[PDB]
């Protein structure tokens, strides 16, 4: 069923909450035993959001290999993503260790450091060229190289140096700064524009490690980003683009991390974004 007609049908009947609860009921349940070990309590932002054991990213250290992060591997679309929580005061060094070890080119951030008057993640990158950051627990240095501030997003060039080997790499930081404190955006136009800027940079392409994408919990806005990207790519690749079923793609992604898409409003917004984005994919 053409999703655009499926959309109007759900909208006229006002059944978004019913559709969304069906997804919650059919979603995979896999163990997350490592996340729940007592030694990892201060490595998790939210008690009810954990990576599955089978898909979690492991840090390359013998001490404690745990970070709240998951590998989402989409086989037909030939795309992979790492979805993670916003870093905590005690995990900023782990976060940049993962970026280094997984050979990522880009980091995608979909929240502000403060929202609703509360801290949603640590200030984990430097704000001035001449004030670099050193992460002593993981032996990394991070420097701000340049910043481009636009109306709806900011893009930063960063240098990450492995102090053990003195290798350096350029990392691109894509920061969507205008998602509202409550609800979802009224139009998907600026979110889609942002997605295309990330694509254009090479950060989603197979010559690099998987992009790292996060919000506060790494499941809601973060799930909207990867769901929209994968659905648009499948519509490009298949003979019949109307065969792409966004609910089935979301359930496939939920095999790799729990809770992706947090509200019925986020589900509707994902539909809207794919419908409007396709009016470029096809050829317009």
In the chain, where the domains are located: 1-284
Tell me whether strands 79-84 and 211-214 are parallel, antiparallel or unpaired.
parallel
Tell me if 15 is assigned to a ligand binding site: no
Method of determination used here:
X-ray
Has 215 been labeled as part of a binding site? yes
Please confirm, yes or no, whether 215 is among the known catalytic residues.
Answer: yes
How far apart CA 22 and CA 30 sit, in angstroms, is 18
Helix 264-281 and helix 3-13: axis angle, to 10°? Answer: 150
Query: What does the alpha-carbon distance between residue 146 and residue 117 come to, in Å, rounded to a whole number?
Result: 28
| Count of alpha carbons within 13 angstroms of residue 179, beta-carbon side | 24
Between CA 27 and CA 162 the distance in angstroms is 39
Residue 105's Cβ-side half-sphere holds a number of Cα atoms within 13 Å equal to: 13
Q: Any bridge partners for residue 142, and if so which? A: 133, 160
284 vs 279: CA distance, rounded Å: 6
For residue 153, give the H/E element and its range: strand 153-162
220 is in an annotated binding site: yes
CA 105 to CA 102: how far, in whole Å?
9
Q: In whole angstroms, give the CA distance from residue 120 to residue 217.
A: 9
**Any known ligand binding at 93?**
no
Torsion-angle region of residue 259: left (phi > 0), alpha (psi -120 to 50) or beta? Answer: left
153, 174 Cβ separation under 8 angstroms: yes
In angstroms, the CA 10 to CA 8 distance is 6
Report the distance separating Cα 181 and Cα 99, nearest Å.
28
Which one of the listed residues 121, 215, 226, 231 is annotated catalytic?
A: 215
How far is residue 113 CA from its own chain's centroid? 16
DSSP-H helix ranges across 37-151: 92-101
- Strand order from edge to edge, sheet including 79-84: 56-58, 66-74, 79-84, 211-214, 106-109, 167-176, 153-162, 140-149, 133-135
- Residues 87 and 70: beta-carbon distance below 8 Å: no
Looking at residue 160, the DSSP 8-state letter turns out to be: E
């Amino acid at each position: 069923m053409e999703m655009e007609k499926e959309f109007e049908q759900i909208d006229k009947s006002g059944s978004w909450a019913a559709i969304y609860q069906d997804i919650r009921h059919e979603a995979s349940d896999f163990p997350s035993r490592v996340a729940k070990l007592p030694k990892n309590k201060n490595r998790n932002r939210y008690r009810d959001v954990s990576p599955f054991d089978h898909s979690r990213i492991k840090l390359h250290q013998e001490d404690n290999d745990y970070i709240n992060a998951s590998l989402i591997k989409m086989e037909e679309a030939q795309r992979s993503y790492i979805l993670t929580q916003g870093p905590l005061p005690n995990t900023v060094g782990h976060f940049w260790e993962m970026v280094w070890e997984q050979k990522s080119r880009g980091v995608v951030m979909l929240n502000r450091v403060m929202e609703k008057g509360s801290l949603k993640c640590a200030q984990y990158w430097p704000q001035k060229e001449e004030k670099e950051m050193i992460f002593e627990d993981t032996n990394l240095k991070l420097t701000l190289i340049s910043e481009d501030i636009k109306s709806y997003y900011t893009v930063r060039q960063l240098e990450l140096e492995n102090l053990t080997t003195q290798e350096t790499r350029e990392i691109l930081h894509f920061h969507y700064t205008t998602w509202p404190d409550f609800g979802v955006p009224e139009s998907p136009a600026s979110f889609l524009n942002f997605l295309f800027k990330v694509r254009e940079s090479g950060s989603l392409s197979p010559e690099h490690g998987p992009v790292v994408v996060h919000c506060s919990a790494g499941i809601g806005r973060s799930g909207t980003f990867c769901l929209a990207d994968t659905c648009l790519l499948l519509m490009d690749k298949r003979k019949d683009p109307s065969s792409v079923d966004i609910k089935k793609v979301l359930l496939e992604m939920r095999k790799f991390r729990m809770g992706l898409i947090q509200t019925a409003d986020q589900l509707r917004f994902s539909y809207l974004a794919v419908i409007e984005g396709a009016k470029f994919i096809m050829g317009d």
